[PDB]
Amino acid sequence: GTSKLKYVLQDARFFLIKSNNHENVSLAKAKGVWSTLPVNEKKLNLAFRSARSVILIFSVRESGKFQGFARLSSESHHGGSPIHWVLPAGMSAKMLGGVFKIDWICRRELPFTKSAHLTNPWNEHKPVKIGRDGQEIELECGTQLCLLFPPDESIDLYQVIHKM
Numbered sequence: 424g425t426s427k428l429k430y431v432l433q434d435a436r437f438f439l440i441k442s443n444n445h446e447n448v449s450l451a452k453a454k455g456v457w458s459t460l461p462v463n464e465k466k467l468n469l470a471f472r473s474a475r476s477v478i479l480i481f482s483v484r485e486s487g488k489f490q491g492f493a494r495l496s497s498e499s500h501h502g503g504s505p506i507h508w509v510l511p512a513g514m515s516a517k518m519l520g521g522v523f524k525i526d527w528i529c530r531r532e533l534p535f536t537k538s539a540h541l542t543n544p545w546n547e548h549k550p551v552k553i554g555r556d557g558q559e560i561e562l563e564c565g566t567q568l569c570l571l572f573p574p575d576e577s578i579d580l581y582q583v584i585h586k587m
């Protein structure tokens with residue numbers, strides 16, 4: 424069903440994450456972690472303290488798709504188990520470094536063709552696929568976008584609800 428998913432998304436905040444490569448999204452799916460640039464790290468930390476759920480919606484550049492979505496379970500933390508991100512040209516490991524723990528809600532893909540009817544008020548009402556890494560998605564658009572994804576029957580939202 425979709426009832427527990429709707430409960431997790433209630434009064435949530437949503438952020439578009441743009442990854443330059445599939446390898447980083449795969450590593451985030453396997454390890455339950457994400458790292459971003461300091462400007463976005465600051466926005467996510469503020470959002471985490473502000474809302475019952477902060478949802479990251481992932482898209483790999485040039486893929487034409489979203490690759491799933493996850494809920495922050497922590498603020499960013501440094502030190503600890505390092506992460507072998509694939510870094511773009513211009514990208515050093517120091518610029519990442521802050522690591523958020525995340526709980527996946529859906530690891531399934533959604534093609535942009537299916538979200539063409541959803542516009543983001545916080546990005547000039549452009550289609551929600553359009554946006555820089557870290558762009559916030561308004562509540563109603565973000566909720567409807569997450570509800571478009573195919574159900575991921577491998578995930579049990581009971582433990583996610585308990586984190587709240």
Ligand SMILES: CNc1nc(Cl)nc2c1ncn2Cc1cccc(OC)c1
Nearest residue numbers: 441442443444447458459460508511556
């Ligand atoms: C593990 N985290 C990430 N991995 C990857 Cl491959 N791309 C990311 C990540 N976070 C944000 N982006 C987008 C990006 C890429 C290169 C230069 C940027 O300067 C604005 C922005």
